[PDB]
């Protein structure tokens, strides 16, 4: 159609290997960027001496 | 050409945190508020 060339089109440079290719109900609670759960628990026992 | 709008987000980062902190806690010590929000001091925590 009447495409707008005035606004530059940023290079895609995307990963075309189907990294995720998944459709869920993705919310914002899945990306708290925490270091797993086992690690936190693992250091918990030693930190408190138990 | 959008950095002008971002440097004004510092207020929001506190508003959202204070909203959640007041949403999840019921009676939190004034000093503890600064530590969770990285306020750097308890004296100014009262005003905000």
């Amino acid at each position: 159609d009447d495409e707008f060339e005035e606004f530059p089109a940023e290079d895609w440079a995307g990963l075309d290997e189907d990294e995720d290719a998944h459709v869920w109900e993705d919310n914002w609670d899945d990306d708290n960027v925490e270091d797993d759960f086992s690690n936190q628990l693992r250091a918990e026992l030693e930190k408190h001496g138990y | 050409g959008t950095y002008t709008l971002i440097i004004r987000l510092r207020h929001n980062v506190i508003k959202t945190g204070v909203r959640m902190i007041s949403l999840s806690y019921s009676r939190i010590s004034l000093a503890d508020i600064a530590q969770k929000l990285q306020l750097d001091s308890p004296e100014d925590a009262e005003f905000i």
Binding site: - | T4, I7, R10, H11, I14, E43, D44, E46, F47, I48
Partner: protein
Amino acid sequence: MYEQLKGEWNRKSPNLSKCGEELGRLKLVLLELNFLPTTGTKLTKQQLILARDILEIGAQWSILRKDIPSFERYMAQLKCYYFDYKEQLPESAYMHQLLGLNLLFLLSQNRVAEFHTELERLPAKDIQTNVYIKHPVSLEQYLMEGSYNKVFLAKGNIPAESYTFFIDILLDTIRDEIAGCIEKAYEKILFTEATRILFFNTPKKMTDYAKKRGWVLGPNNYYSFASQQQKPEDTTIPSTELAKQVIEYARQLEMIV
């Protein structure tokens, strides 16, 4: 040609009636040189700087005389000079000092709409550099949130000069806000925290402050009661609003538009 300003312009005047020296000049410039942008005559760069110099020197004595209405009239003029699209010197001797002098003023008048709309004239000197404008902008964020202990800390650190002609204006915009915040339904606060909090040890200002505000005087007991409960919990007034609302649903559900 017809400088008229080489006499004693450089020296200080303790509230001297030095305006008269300027008056005869700003008239003669326009007959001498046109201070409008005047895109034509791009190569002729010498003429303007004399006009600009007559201008930026205006702020020096002005800001010192506590001249609000006269002040704005000068900021309007000078800025255009810094902004002219004709070729000129990239930066003057007071490039940033004066511009912020205007910006700090806009915040003082509680006009934040123009403050943010004015920063874009400064591309990337807001925070990274331009110590002249970093403080005035920082003052905006601090006031936007409740962080005020920093405001007095910055009140003693000014980039250009004492700038006291504006800090006095902020006093009106701070104390009135602080009192309003404390007005909520809190309990008694003794006259010991509110007294030695901001800058003063044991003045009488609060006594006047309490007088013009509420804070009923008691046995060292100050109250701040807020109910906002009698007014709510009513639908009779909502009844009229609701009736109009539903009828519109009926209106826009039956009749053809």
